[PDB]
Amino acid sequence: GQSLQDPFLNALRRERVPVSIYLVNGIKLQGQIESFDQFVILLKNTVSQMVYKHAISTVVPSRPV
Amino acid sequence: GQSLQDPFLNALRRERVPVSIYLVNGIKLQGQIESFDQFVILLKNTVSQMVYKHAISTVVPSRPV
Amino acid sequence: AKGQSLQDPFLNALRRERVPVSIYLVNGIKLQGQIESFDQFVILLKNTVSQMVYKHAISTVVPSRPV
Amino acid sequence: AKGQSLQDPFLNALRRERVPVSIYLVNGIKLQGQIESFDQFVILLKNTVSQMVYKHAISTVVPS
Amino acid sequence: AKGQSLQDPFLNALRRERVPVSIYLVNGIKLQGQIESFDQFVILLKNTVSQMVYKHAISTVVPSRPV
Amino acid sequence: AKGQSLQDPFLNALRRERVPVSIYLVNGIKLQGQIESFDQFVILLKNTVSQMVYKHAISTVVPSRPV
DNA sequence: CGGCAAAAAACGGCAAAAAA
DNA sequence: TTTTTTGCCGTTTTTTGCCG
Ligand SMILES: [Zn+2]
Ligand SMILES: [Zn+2]
Ligand SMILES: [Zn+2]
Ligand SMILES: [Zn+2]
Ligand SMILES: [Zn+2]
Ligand SMILES: [Zn+2]
Numbered sequence: 001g002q003s004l005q006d007p008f009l010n011a012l013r014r015e016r017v018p019v020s021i022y023l024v025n026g027i028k029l030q031g032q033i034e035s036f037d038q039f040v041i042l043l044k045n046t047v048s049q050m051v052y053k054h055a056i057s058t059v060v061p062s063r064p065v
Numbered sequence: 066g067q068s069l070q071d072p073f074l075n076a077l078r079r080e081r082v083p084v085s086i087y088l089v090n091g092i093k094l095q096g097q098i099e100s101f102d103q104f105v106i107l108l109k110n111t112v113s114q115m116v117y118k119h120a121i122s123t124v125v126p127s128r129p130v
Numbered sequence: 131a132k133g134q135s136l137q138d139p140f141l142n143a144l145r146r147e148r149v150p151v152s153i154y155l156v157n158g159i160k161l162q163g164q165i166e167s168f169d170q171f172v173i174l175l176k177n178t179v180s181q182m183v184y185k186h187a188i189s190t191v192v193p194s195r196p197v
Numbered sequence: 198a199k200g201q202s203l204q205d206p207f208l209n210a211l212r213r214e215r216v217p218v219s220i221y222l223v224n225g226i227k228l229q230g231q232i233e234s235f236d237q238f239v240i241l242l243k244n245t246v247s248q249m250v251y252k253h254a255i256s257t258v259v260p261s
Numbered sequence: 262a263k264g265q266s267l268q269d270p271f272l273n274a275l276r277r278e279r280v281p282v283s284i285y286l287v288n289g290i291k292l293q294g295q296i297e298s299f300d301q302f303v304i305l306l307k308n309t310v311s312q313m314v315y316k317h318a319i320s321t322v323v324p325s326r327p328v
Numbered sequence: 329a330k331g332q333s334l335q336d337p338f339l340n341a342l343r344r345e346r347v348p349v350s351i352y353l354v355n356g357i358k359l360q361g362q363i364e365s366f367d368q369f370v371i372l373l374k375n376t377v378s379q380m381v382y383k384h385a386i387s388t389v390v391p392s393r394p395v
Numbered sequence: 396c397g398g399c400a401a402a403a404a405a406c407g408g409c410a411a412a413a414a415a
Numbered sequence: 416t417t418t419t420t421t422g423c424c425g426t427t428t429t430t431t432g433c434c435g
Contacts, residue, residue, distance in 0.1 A: 002404090003102035006131050008115050010403075023189050024090055024120050025156055037136035047192060050140050055156050055189035057088055057120035065113060069236040073249055089224055089254050122222055122254035126246055131403080133423070138263075155320055157287055169267040179327040182271050187287050187320035198367035199336070200413070207372070207380050223355060223385050256353055256385035259377060269330075286387055288354055300334035310391055313338055318354050318387035368413095 001038065009036045012061055019043075021051060022058040073124075074101050082128045089122050141168045143197050153183060154190045201237075207258075208235045217261040222254045229261075272299050275324060282306075284314060285321045293325070339366045341395050349373075350390045351381060 012019055013033040021029040021043060031045030041051045077084055078098045086094040086108065094116065099107035106116045106124075144151055145165040153161040153175065163177035173183045173191075211218055212232045220228040220242065230244035240250045275282050276296040284292040284306060292314065294306035304314045342349055343363040351359045351373065361375035371381045 001131065004100050004107060005102060005105040005115065007404080008105075008107070010131070023156070024088070025158060025189065026090060027158075027189075029190070035136050037131060038133040040137045040140075042136060042140070047194075047196070049190050049192040050137065051190050052185065052188055053117065054119060054186060056117055057090070057092070058094075058117070059115045061112060061114070066236045067238060069234050069241065070239045070249070073239075073241075089222075091224060091226075118251065119253055121251050122224070122226070123228070123242075123248050123250050125248040129246055132425095155287070157289065157320070159320075161321070167262075167267055169262055170264050172265075172268040172271075174267060174271065179323060179325075181321050181323040182268060183321050184316065184319050186317060198365060200368045200415095202414095203365050203367040203372055204370045204380065207370075223353070225355065225357075252382065253384060255382055256355070256357075257359070257379050257381045259379045286354070288356060288387070290356075290387070292388070298329060298334050300329045300331055302332070303335045303338075305334065305338075306388075310393075311395060312388050312390040313335065314388050315383065315386050317384060 009033055009041070009059075011065065012059070017065065018062040020060040020062060021056055022060065023051075023055050024057045025055075074098060074106065076130060077124075077126060080128070080130060082126050082130075085125045085127065086116060086121055087123045087125065088120050090120075138168075140197075141165060141173070141191070144191070144193060147197060149197050150194045152192045152194060153188055154192065155183075155187050156189045157187075208232060208240070211258075211260065219259045219261065220250060220255055221257045221259065222250075223256045224254070272296055272304065272322075275322075280324050280328075281326050283323045283325045284319055285323070286314075286318050287320045288318070338395065339363055339371065339389075342389075342391060348392045350392070351386055352388045352390065353385050354387050355385075 016032050018030065018032060029043055029051065031043040033041060034044040034048060035042040039053055041053065043049055043051050081097055083095060084098060094108060096108045096110035099109045099113055101107060104118050106118060108114050108116050148164050150164055161175055161183065163175040166174045166176035166180055168174065171185055173185060175181050175183050215231055217229065217231055228242055228250065230242040233241035233243040233247055235241065238252055240252060242248045242250050279295060281293065281295055286292065292306055294308040297305040297307035297311055299305060302316050304316065306312050306314050343365065346362055348362055359373060359381065361373040364372040364374040364378060366372060369383055371383065373379050373381050
């Protein structure tokens with residue numbers, strides 16, 4: 001979890017808000033949160049890839065929340 | 066103990082002090098601290114972005130306290 | 131949103147169908163191959179030779195034809 | 198030793214005696230300053246404005 | 262599957278048969294050598310010197326000699 | 329093996345015998361010195377000035393001569 | 396307008412691992 | 416070792432949207 005992360009990701013997932021995930025290496029990924037558990041986030045754009053949280057630096061929701 | 070990270074972040078949150086969050090890759094993220102939990106800091110500039118703590122090196126206030 | 135409820139079904143789905151995957155590491159290195167098996171911290175990637183890949187060095191796991 | 202033992206007294210001795218330190222991060226950035234407080238995960242740096250340093254970014258802590 | 266059900270039998274298999282291995286770090290450095298021993302966090306890479314490699318710095322462990 | 333069977337006896341042996349070691353970090357910088365002491369997360373390394381080295385920044389601990 | 400069911404998020408018990 | 420803490424999972428209770 002939890003507390004501030006999970007409701008944030010859930011709110012972003014429900015409203016299909018486009019997001020810009022920034023990895024620690026600098027690479028930006030775009031798409032929508034399809035699912036997420038404690039360690040990974042299922043990012044969906046034209047393919048549906050699994051992204052490890054430990055590699056993620058920031059999750060930037062493209063439209064105000 | 067986790068007892069120096071909380072009172073710090075809450076102090077910053079309460080005083081609405083503009084901070085500079087450095088990432089491990091050298092990126093500087095200026096803005097306000099909306100809320101936080103064990104592993105994420107919510108950071109508020111033109112958009113509320115979620116920042117993973119594990120990607121953060123230093124959190125530098127522009128003010129004291 | 132529960133611990134490990136998504137990663138395991140995802141990887142198991144990728145392996146059981148032997149779907150070709152591209153595993154991007156945190157350093158940029160792309161590892162093309164097929165998930166042969168996985169556990170809590172590692173993923174055994176099989177292409178030419180079965181190499182063990184640590185998950186903490188993994189950024190993304192991208193399937194090449196949908197799962 | 199075994200279990201969170203050497204780290205705490207090292208930082209404590211650095212804090213009590215107000216000893217100036219240079220903190221080398223995993224990227225290469227050198228942060229000189231003074232240790233005001235510390236806990237399991239973070240370290241106050243004092244210097245000009247108390248700045249919070251995450252240990253997971255810290256490579257080493259060298260006394261002066 | 263789960264836990265270390267895979268990374269332990271793998272490293273063990275690399276250690277009993279004493280196959281030469283190739284340990285890529287997350288920084289790009291390649292470490293050829295041979296698994297002498299390992300525990301939860303470290304791996305003993307024997308060569309001219311036995312060096313202790315931390316798992317959190319390891320990205321891929323490839324069997325050369327493979328098979 | 330499991331646990332810290334192998335990482336504690338190694339560092340302890342390197343400390344008892346005051347063996348000079350080269351500690352490589354994940355960024356490539358090569359520290360050198362002598363294990364004064366160590367615990368779960370850090371290693372106290374003593375050379376011209378004693379310093380505290382976080383294990384999470386360490387890739388390998390390479391002795392000069394055997395264990 | 397009132398139950399019905401999906402889902403979240405808070406509560407609590409369990410048991411491995413840290414601390415003493 | 417003993418004792419304690421804490422992250423780990425399973426449950427309940429509340430919400431919310433659909434359906435009756
Ligand atoms: Zn995290
Ligand atoms: Zn941290
Ligand atoms: Zn690991
Ligand atoms: Zn991970
Ligand atoms: Zn640490
Ligand atoms: Zn470690």
